[PDB]
């Protein structure tokens, strides 16, 4: 279910000069702009974001409208909203591109030998479970063959 724009609602910036940074709505200007501040991040000082560039998250600190910029740092510390976000899967996809957009050619090789490992293991586990149950196409056709040939 969609998450409403309210004072305290954590938004992630979509495609500004920030592109991935989370921020807390501290005031709503009108039908298309809010004030966004995250004291934990350096680039996230109290600025004005258009609501076409925000993405509301499921987390919402209990803070009031037009906060005092020091009770905001108190509000997201007691709520632990930044740490609950930091273990979601969508936040892991944000920090994963930051490795891909900073990877050297050697650690792109390490990702390729990691994926070819897991792929080699998942296809030999799939081998030694398809001998027991005839699931795959090689094993359905041979099971419906040896029973009458």
């Amino acid at each position: 279910k969609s998450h409403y724009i309210c004072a305290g609602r954590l938004v992630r910036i979509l495609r500004g000069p920030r592109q991935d940074r989370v921020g807390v709505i501290v005031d709503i200007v009108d039908a298309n702009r809010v004030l966004v501040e995250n004291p934990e991040d350096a680039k996230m000082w109290r600025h004005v974001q258009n609501l076409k560039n925000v993405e509301p998250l499921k987390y919402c600190v209990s803070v009031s409208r037009n906060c005092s910029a020091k009770a905001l740092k108190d509000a997201l510390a007691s709520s632990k909203a930044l740490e609950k976000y930091a273990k979601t899967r969508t936040a892991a996809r944000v920090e994963a591109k930051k490795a891909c957009a900073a990877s050297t050619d050697f650690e792109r090789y390490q990702l390729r030998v990691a994926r070819r490992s897991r792929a080699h293991w998942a296809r030999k586990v799939f081998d030694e479970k398809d001998a027991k149950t005839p699931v795959s196409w090689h094993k359905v056709a041979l099971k419906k063959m040896q029973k009458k040939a």
Binding site: A96, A99, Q110, L111, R118, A122, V125, S136
Partner: protein, 221 residues
């Protein structure tokens, strides 16, 4: 066009593997008629081979009565001296889309005729197109991002059945029979789709752990 015996003996003298060219297949369900036609008219002219599918599901903005009158104003045009030499008024949704692409091409040169014969434009999904790869989509033309949802729209298969196009019900029984068939195929292999993903979660901890915290740095766990 079936291949002739000169084109069949050379595929036996030379042992020709079965070849398929690089063909991009667009699923045009819920697309803007002229925004999809302009994306296609540029890609065909950049040398893309494009099969277009499900043309009875294209949308045109406005009331169905509005877009049906604009076709009937188009059908009002004919060469009065000899209408066999006139504008030819195609009623199929698959042929409305070929025209709308063609009117965005340089139609009267050879480069714009090599690009309009690169487009195929079926309606429904025919049996040769079904199992040839995942269909693609044009996300800048998809009616849920391009039309304001309070405004009416017009399905092209419904505008065209009331101006001609006597094969509306044939397409509706060929696509009812497909989605019944393709959903029987998809309840099948659900113990093959779950077989791999319970083997790709089991491949972890059967693989060395120094290749897993590099597989968790890039988020591929």
């Amino acid at each position: 066009a079936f291949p002739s015996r000169k084109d069949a003996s050379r595929a036996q003298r030379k042992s020709a593997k079965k070849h398929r060219p690089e063909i991009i297949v667009i699923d045009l369900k819920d697309h803007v008629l002229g925004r999809a036609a302009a994306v296609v008219a540029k890609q065909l002219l950049l040398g893309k081979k494009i099969t277009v599918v499900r043309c009875e599901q294209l949308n045109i903005a406005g009331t169905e009565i509005r877009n049906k009158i604009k076709y009937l104003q188009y059908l009002r045009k004919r060469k009065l001296t000899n209408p066999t030499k006139g504008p030819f008024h195609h009623r199929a949704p698959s042929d409305v889309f070929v025209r709308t692409v063609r009117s965005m091409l340089p139609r009267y040169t050879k480069r714009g005729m090599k690009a309009l014969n690169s487009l195929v434009a079926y309606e429904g999904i025919p049996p040769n197109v079904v199992r040839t790869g995942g269909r693609v989509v044009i996300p800048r033309a998809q009616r849920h991002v391009c039309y304001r949802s309070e405004r009416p729209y017009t399905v092209l298969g419904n505008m065209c059945k009331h101006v001609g196009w006597k094969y509306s019900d044939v397409v509706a029984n060929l696509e009812k029979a497909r989605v019944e068939k393709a959903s029987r195929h998809h309840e099948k292999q659900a113990k093959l789709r779950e077989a791999w993903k319970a083997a790709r979660k089991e491949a972890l901890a059967k693989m060395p752990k120094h290749n897993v915290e590099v597989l968790k740095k890039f988020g591929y766990a």
